[PDB]
């Protein structure tokens, strides 16, 4: 009925704010990106440092794995994305086109495509093999906070400070839906549920919401945590019970019962805003990461 995540590992290495953490699909590795311009690879189970990957000229806001755990795309303030062969650590491609910071990115499940969102208010679709930008979508009238493909790559969802979440048809680049609430607070994060039927979004008014994307109907609502300034990554946790994990500007990691919307746990340990969390694909492991005054990445584990 409740999880009991407890601290197991603290990973130190980044010399400025951490910005995102992601578990490789095969569950072996955790990748992290930082304002210190670096990507770092760590063992997913022992928090043991693997390697450092470099090349970006400015800080990095997001990183993301290909489905086969072998490549990584990163998005940075240097106005580019890079694609990386993880085991060799070489930059396969540099993706050029955005005219300001690239804030978020992701592979499709096929991983022949890459989607990015930028401060320039655009969402772009890139071809992995060539590095070429396939489509540029005029997605928002403010910076784009998150971008994500659904389970089959047919749909992209995107969120923005302009207050909107939009669903796009990958094939045509057509806007299929615009999610409108009552007050349209800046949307600082969005992602699909694993089946791709629902979408989780976070708003800069201390609220996470679960939406039925088709009906365009908000359903569950999760509050209690703190989010009014930073884009905090949130998650569906589904390896044990069913929960919703989010970072929080009160230095805590919050955990919710998916159904009741009640807080079932709050993890103490960090010393600055918890900017990003991730959930292990198979194990009840949660990875968390923090801003400038902490710089550490923590790994927690639970039985439920």
């Amino acid at each position: 009925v409740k999880p009991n995540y407890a601290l197991k590992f603290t990973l130190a290495g980044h010399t400025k704010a951490v910005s995102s953490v992601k578990f490789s699909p095969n569950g072996e590795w955790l990748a992290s990106s930082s304002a210190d311009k670096l990507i770092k690879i760590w063992g997913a189970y022992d928090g043991k440092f693997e390697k450092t990957i470099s090349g970006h000229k400015l800080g990095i806001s997001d990183v993301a794995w290909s489905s086969d755990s072998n490549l990584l795309v990163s998005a940075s303030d240097d106005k580019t994305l890079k694609i990386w062969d993880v085991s060799s650590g070489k930059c396969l491609k540099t993706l050029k086109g955005h005219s300001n910071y690239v804030f978020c990115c992701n592979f499709n499940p096929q991983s022949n495509l890459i989607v990015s969102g930028s401060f320039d208010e655009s969402v772009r679709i890139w071809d992995v093999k060539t590095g070429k930008c396939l489509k540029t979508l005029p997605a928002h009238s403010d910076p784009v906070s998150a971008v994500h493909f659904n389970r089959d790559g047919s749909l992209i969802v995107s969120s923005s400070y302009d207050g909107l979440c939009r669903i796009w048809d990958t094939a045509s680049g057509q806007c299929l839906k615009t999610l409108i609430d009552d007050d349209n607070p800046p949307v600082s994060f969005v992602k699909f549920s694993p089946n791709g039927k629902y979408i989780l979004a976070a708003t800069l008014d201390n609220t996470l919401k679960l939406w039925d994307y088709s009906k365009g109907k908000c359903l569950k609502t999760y509050t209690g945590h703190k989010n009014e300034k930073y884009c905090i990554f949130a998650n569906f946790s589904v390896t044990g019970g069913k929960w919703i994990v989010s970072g929080s500007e009160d230095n805590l990691v919050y955990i919710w019962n998916l159904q009741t919307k009640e807080i079932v746990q709050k993890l103490q340990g960090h010393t600055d805003v918890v900017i990003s969390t991730a959930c292990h694909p198979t194990e009840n492991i949660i990875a968390s990461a923090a801003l400038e005054n902490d710089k550490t990445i923590k790994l927690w584990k639970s039985d439920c």
Binding site: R151, S193, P194, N195, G196, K197, Y198, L210, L219, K220, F236, V238, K242, L258, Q259
Partner: peptide, 10 residues
């Protein structure tokens, strides 16, 4: 309000 299945792909 009502149950929601987030993992099932039917």
């Amino acid at each position: 309000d009502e149950e929601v299945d987030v993992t099932s792909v039917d």
